[PDB]
């Protein structure tokens, strides 16, 4: 009859509630009318092609604007002293001083300074001209199309796959490991040795000459013969100019380690070697499980056989195979969990080990990328912990999982939750305690009475890596051991050079200030996990509500009876954790940024002393770096940072607006609207017009969402405005 068509019960709502909820439930296929397992699987599979189409289109546009409105070529010729251009600006509201200030990077008009690091990435892989960027944009536009073509193709009956096909896991793993991971990594190693590395050295190897240009002097033979060391005889000289055939070796596969001294980035030869190396593990690994040829494993049976006799895990993992394969919420929560972990692994390894040329010197880009991925990694983790409860409520079969490791979690759930409470309470009581204590004496003017615990455990790890600072005498920095000498030159000499670099971010110096914050982050992790698992383990029910299983993942509440039951659903527990997640990542990004902007200014001394007490954070970090930001537009002038000053205030406004939906609740607003409904009816010249949807206050759950969205958007945008401007201003 009406929108939403997928929900008839929703479509018959006379109020404005239907339009809202029609949007918020469009992707929840399992709740749609007359849903079948068949319809469920190839809706996702088709929605999957839709997502790919967006990514390729989004990436196509990036290659387009940089080629059309970005200099790039000007950037290539002097990567150190030119600012990359994202795209042009066209805004009628712009005053002349605006068009003025934003004209940068040698552009004919006002543009935006790119902080995505696409310039360094594209330059490192071998893109040298705008023409190259266009061909990529066209190719991605074409890739974006065939994704839609495949999406449309499998929605057709003559090409649609069976659910069982989707549930054949043994073969999907075998291909994804061997093909999706292995081959793609192998193919990339080819681009590196054919284009990236030779493009780095100085030769332009492209489609019209790649067929006639050897990647290596010696033939393809040495690989096939067996002697592969010949691919490492002649590496690039330390004093090598990128994009210049100066001090350029011939080797296409090395393990030098450390950084290319001019670019401060990892060697391309190391990477061409890396991907080639990992491709194999993936390639062999993608041949573990059984398919149609008579050899291979059975995942189920391996899970079945893993039962420790004599307790204490019970039935082990029996029936666990079918619980996962029949539940795509388990799979997603399992996927987000793994993806979320390596998302941070990207953030941690990309600032410590820069992969692209001239990215380490672009301090605004480095800060942005780390902060970017940590918040991305943050939200992903809350999703892995969100599809968890949904699995328990919608897809969990208690009987089929009788006394296995999964079912043993629900029967001692009070143990996991209470100790998470203890660990959270422990960390909080002392981390906050040590902080406040330190502020007291500095107020009292006696900073020599502070509790400054030296992170001696972590410093012991640093010395174990090769850092000759401190007197620890541990592996890779000791007097006699099998570890360092296993270096056998190769990685160690180039890498040990890199670790004792006082300039790079590769293993910075840490102290008492680094101790307190790491505990704050540990507090943030534990508490967030406490909230999320408690929502998961009590998703099917508690003692306050034993039949929570019968109400679904998201419901408003259970009423004011039995003392009150506000925010008792597993959905709300997620919604509460999102707050704690933002706080945690907030502390992480604060800690990363401040320690770096003090390092970049050549003044780590200020961080080492001000980070030990909380007033230092608010003043020497928050207050101190805001001056240039908040003067983006002044009652006297107008700078290029005016965008960020405005967005800074914008973020504050969205943030505070969420507070309205989180503090004030529905019954007040509904009664207010009822008076407004009366008004409109009794007002002449306005009676002629009537609404087609009954005006009602937002729902209890909707408001918690809407408020959280405001809270999260303002949270991000405010810090984004500050992270960029404060860093861009000083550089």
């Amino acid at each position: 009859l009406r929108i939403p068509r997928f929900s008839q019960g929703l479509a018959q709502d006379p109020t404005t509630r239907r339009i809202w909820f029609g949007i918020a439930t469009a992707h929840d296929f399992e709740s749609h009318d007359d849903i079948t397992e068949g319809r469920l699987y190839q809706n996702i599979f088709a929605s999957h092609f839709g997502q790919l189409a967006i990514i390729f289109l989004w990436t196509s546009g990036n290659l387009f604007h940089v080629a059309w409105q970005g200099n790039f070529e000007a950037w290539v010729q002097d990567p150190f002293h030119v600012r990359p251009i994202a795209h042009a600006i066209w805004d009628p509201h712009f005053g002349q001083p605006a068009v003025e200030a934003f004209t940068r990077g040698g552009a004919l008009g006002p543009v935006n300074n790119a902080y995505s690091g696409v310039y360094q990435w594209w330059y490192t892989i071998g893109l040298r001209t705008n023409e190259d960027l266009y061909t990529g944009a066209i190719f991605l536009l074409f890739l974006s199309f065939i994704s839609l073509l495949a999406g449309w193709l499998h929605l057709q009956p003559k090409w649609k796959p069976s659910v069982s096909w989707f549930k054949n896991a043994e073969s999907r793993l075998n291909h994804h490991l061997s093909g999706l991971f292995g081959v793609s990594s192998l193919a990339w190693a080819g681009h590196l040795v054919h284009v990236a590395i030779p493009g780095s050295r100085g030769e332009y190897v492209r489609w019209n000459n790649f067929l006639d240009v050897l990647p290596y002097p010696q033939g393809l033979g040495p690989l096939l013969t067996g002697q592969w060391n010949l691919y490492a005889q002649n590496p690039s000289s330390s004093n090598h100019l990128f994009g210049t055939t100066q001090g350029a070796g011939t080797a296409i596969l090395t393990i030098l380690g450390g950084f290319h001294p001019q670019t401060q980035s990892l060697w391309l030869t190391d990477m061409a070697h890396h991907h080639l190396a990992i491709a194999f593990l993936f390639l062999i690994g993608g041949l573990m499980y059984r398919t149609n040829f008579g050899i291979g494993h059975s995942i189920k049976y391996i899970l079945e056989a893993h039962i420790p006799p004599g307790g204490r895990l019970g039935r082990g993992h029996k029936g666990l195979y079918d619980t996962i394969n029949n539940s795509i919420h388990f799979q997603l929560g399992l996927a987000l969990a793994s993806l979320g972990v390596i998302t941070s692994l990207v953030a941690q390894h990309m600032y410590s080990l820069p992969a692209y040329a001239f990215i380490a010197q672009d301090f605004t880009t480095q800060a942005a990328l780390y902060t970017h991925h940590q918040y991305i990694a943050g939200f992903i983790m809350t999703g892995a912990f969100a599809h968890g409860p949904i699995f328990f409520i919608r897809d969990y079969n208690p009987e089929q999982n009788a006394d296995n490791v999964l079912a043993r979690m629900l029967e001692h759930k009070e143990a996991i939750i209470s100790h998470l409470s203890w660990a959270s309470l422990f960390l909080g009581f002392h981390t906050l305690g040590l902080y406040v204590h330190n502020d007291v004496m500095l107020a009292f003017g006696t900073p020599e009475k502070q509790i400054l615990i030296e992170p001696i455990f972590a410093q012991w790890i640093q010395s174990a890596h090769g850092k000759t600072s401190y007197g620890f005498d541990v592996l890779l920095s000791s007097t006699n051991s099998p570890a360092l000498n296993a270096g056998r030159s190769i990685w160690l000499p180039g890498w040990l050079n890199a670790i004792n670099e006082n300039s790079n971010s590769l293993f910075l110096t840490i102290g008492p200030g680094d101790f307190l914050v790491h505990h704050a982050i540990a507090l943030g992790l534990h508490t967030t996990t406490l909230i999320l698992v408690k929502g998961a383990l009590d998703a099917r029910g508690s003692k306050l509500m034993p039949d929570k299983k019968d109400f679904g993942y998201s419901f408003p509440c259970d009423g004011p009876g039995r003392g009150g039951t506000c925010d008792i659903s597993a959905w709300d527990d997620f919604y509460l954790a999102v707050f704690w997640m933002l706080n945690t990542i907030g502390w992480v990004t604060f800690y990363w940024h401040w320690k770096h902007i003090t390092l970049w200014q050549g003044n780590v001394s200020q961080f080492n002393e001000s980070s030990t007490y909380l007033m230092g954070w608010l003043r020497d970090y928050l207050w101190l770096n805001s001056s240039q930001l908040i003067n983006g537009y002044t009652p006297l002038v107008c700078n290029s940072l005016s965008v960020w000053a405005w967005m800074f205030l914008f973020g504050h406004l969205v943030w505070a607006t969420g507070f309205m939906f989180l503090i004030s609740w529905r019954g007040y607003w509904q009664e207010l609207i009822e008076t407004l409904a009366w008004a409109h009816e009794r007002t002449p010249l306005a009676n002629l017009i009537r609404w087609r949807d009954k005006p009602v206050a937002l729902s209890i759950v909707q408001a918690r969402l809407v408020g959280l969205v405001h809270f999260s958007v303002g949270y991000i945008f405010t810090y984004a405005a500050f992270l960029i401007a404060s860093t861009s201003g000083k550089f």
Binding site: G9, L10, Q12, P14, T15, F555, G559, G561, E674, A677
Partner: protein, 80 residues
């Protein structure tokens, strides 16, 4: 509209009915308990879903359960 159910664990104290302001429930002759009565939910159409009935139930966990389902003007409690 809203979905309400009654369970045999009831003891016929009739408090769920007295609590309801829209008259959704009523008492029914039954042989299951000493009162020999039991709650009934005939008029779910007039149910607003406020769970006043649940806060009057003395049974260890509720014998009457309200499951908020599809919304209607009556359930939305609108006077306009």
């Amino acid at each position: 509209s809203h979905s309400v159910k009654i369970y045999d664990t009831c003891i016929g104290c009739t408090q769920c009915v007295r609590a309801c302001p829209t008259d959704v429930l009523e008492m029914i002759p039954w042989g299951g308990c000493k009162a020999k009565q039991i709650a009934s939910a005939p008029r779910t159409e007039d149910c607003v879903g406020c769970k006043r009935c649940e806060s009057a139930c003395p049974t260890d966990f509720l014998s009457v359960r309200v499951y908020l389902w599809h919304e209607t003007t009556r359930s939305m409690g609108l006077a306009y």
